Design a protein around this ligand. Structure first.
Ligand SMILES: O=C(Nc1ccccc1)c1ccccc1[SeH]
Ligand SMILES: O=C(Nc1ccccc1)c1ccccc1[SeH]
Ligand SMILES: [Zn+2]
Ligand SMILES: [Zn+2]
Ligand SMILES: [Zn+2]
Ligand SMILES: [Zn+2]
Lengths: 153, 153
């Protein structure tokens, strides 16, 4: 098994801990944890290309897209590798994250270790927003919190 | 060329930005940047095994040591991959970092991306301190600041 972890930090405080576990290189990645300090509703959840947080979340670059595809939701064939959809925050502002994803990996050229996990202001429209931006970013607004994805024990 | 970057933060005044560049596969890695908020003198400079900053620097684990060697300095044969020696802070508390290292890498088994860069309270004795701890950690004291090493553009 390979394991990774990410601390999400940004103003609010929006703060979170996200764990990644992959039992074999050819297998899905289980993504679990918690994010607090969010507004109730959906928040875009992306792996951005660079693990560069030198100017905060703005330095992380575009959606991680090694295969040169368009933006989508995690269940879509047409998606970026970094398209993990939305997390859902309750009325206490807590998003309990539980995702399994077959496209991200913790090895090979879909590897997300060393890249930036980002939680967004607004919902990711999953490429179904009806404008040009929808199929590039999903219109999820500002980057509320982020962190670099690291190797875990 | 491959590039990586790391933002060093902690609980106190120490903060920094460190850049990594490796022009050729299996070539030396250039390390440069700046750290401020330090006491004047030598400060241990390590890649630790885990990119896990969930409890700050304390979760980063031992020295990155994929080859099962003892602790040393960067110019020693007997060293951990993560043994980058010391950085030097001036009387303004600023350390200008400029290192070339041929043991760390930005790809493969020696890869430091997704691991934690740590700057220490005290000098790393480079395995020459005269106690057992010297050849395990180098006696560099507390972890003042750290961050996860991320992929850069
Ligand atoms: O292993 C990685 N990439 C990779 C890319 C292409 C072929 C084989 C391997 C990787 C690189 C940097 C950080 C994290 C990982 Se997982
Ligand atoms: O690139 C990496 N490994 C790797 C391993 C075997 C073949 C090719 C590449 C890597 C994995 C995890 C974190 C960081 C790096 Se740089
Ligand atoms: Zn995003
Ligand atoms: Zn996308
Ligand atoms: Zn250390
Ligand atoms: Zn060491």
């Amino acid at each position: 098994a390979t394991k990774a972890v990410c601390v999400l930090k940004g103003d609010g405080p929006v703060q979170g801990i996200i764990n990644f576990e992959q039992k074999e290189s050819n297998g899905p990645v289980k993504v679990w944890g918690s994010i607090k300090g969010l507004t109730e509703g959906l928040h875009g959840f992306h792996v951005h290309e660079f693990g560069d947080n030198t100017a905060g979340c703005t330095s992380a670059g575009p959606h991680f897209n090694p295969l040169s595809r368009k933006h989508g939701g995690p269940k879509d064939e047409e998606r970026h590798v970094g398209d993990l959809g939305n997390v859902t925050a309750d009325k206490d502002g807590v998003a309990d994250v539980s995702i399994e994803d077959s496209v991200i990996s913790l090895s090979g050229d879909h590897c997300i270790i060393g890249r930036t996990l980002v939680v967004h202001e607004k919902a990711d429209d999953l490429g179904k927003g009806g404008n040009e931006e929808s199929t590039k970013t999903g219109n999820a607004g500002s980057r509320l919190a982020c962190g670099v994805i690291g190797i875990a024990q």
